[PDB]
Amino acid sequence: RDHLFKVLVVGDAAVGKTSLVQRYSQDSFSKHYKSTVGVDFALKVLQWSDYEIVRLQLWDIAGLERFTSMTRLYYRDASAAVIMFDVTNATTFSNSQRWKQDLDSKLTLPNGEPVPALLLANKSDLSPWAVSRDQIDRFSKENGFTGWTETSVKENKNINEAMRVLIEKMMRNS
Numbered sequence: 001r002d003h004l005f006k007v008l009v010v011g012d013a014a015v016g017k018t019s020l021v022q023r024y025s026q027d028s029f030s031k032h033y034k035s036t037v038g039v040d041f042a043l044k045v046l047q048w049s050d051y052e053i054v055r056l057q058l059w060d061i062a063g064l065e066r067f068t069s070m071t072r073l074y075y076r077d078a079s080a081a082v083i084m085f086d087v088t089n090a091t092t093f094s095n096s097q098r099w100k101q102d103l104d105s106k107l108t109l110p111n112g113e114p115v116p117a118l119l120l121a122n123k124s125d126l127s128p129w130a131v132s133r134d135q136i137d138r139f140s141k142e143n144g145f146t147g148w149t150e151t152s153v154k155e156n157k158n159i160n161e162a163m164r165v166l167i168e169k170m171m172r173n174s
């Protein structure tokens with residue numbers, strides 16, 4: 001059995017989105033697949049059990065990231081969103097509210113419920129931050145995120161584990 005999940009990686013310019021996809025996709029292991037799959041997204045494939053795999057399409061909002069509003073070809077049929085901000089740039093934090101409001105205005109799961117949304121406070125390795133952890137938690141709750149965590153794509157801190165718990169949630173919602 002194959003479980004296919006389209007995951008949106010959204011957030012303002014310069015927060016670390018392309019770096020997250022480059023680290024977490026399979027592209028540092030093999031890119032042979034791109035010639036027939038294309039490049040709208042990057043893949044990651046994981047064995048899930050003896051008879052099941054999980055396949056993730058990682059969609060980077062990329063060229064339209066500064067518009068803070070997703071287009072239909074980008075968001076359609078997604079199973080989750082990773083909304084990234086830079087802890088050192090409060091504008092990217094504030095704009096995560098606009099990204100989340102846009103997601104919920106555009107997309108639900110097939111059952112009509114909201115898509116899971118994981119808020120990543122990225123660049124946690126830098127100092128000082130422009131927001132506090134208590135501020136992030138209140139913001140995550142007030143805006144209806146599934147949860148939040150700090151990450152450093154640069155130091156590979158919390159990346160794999162944050163994505164892993166999101167996969168497990170997408171499997172539960174399947």
Ligand SMILES: Nc1nc2c(ncn2[C@@H]2O[C@H](COP(=O)(O)OP(=O)(O)O)[C@@H](O)[C@H]2O)c(=O)[nH]1
Nearest residue numbers: 013014015016017018019122123124152153154
């Ligand atoms: N210090 C630090 N730099 C990061 C981190 N993640 C990304 N960067 C850097 O931030 C810059 C922008 O990253 P990029 O992935 O292009 O951001 P995007 O514009 O959201 O795609 C690059 O120089 C990255 O190396 C992080 O966790 N910590």
Ligand SMILES: [Mg+2]
Nearest residue numbers: 017018019062
């Ligand atoms: Mg980018």
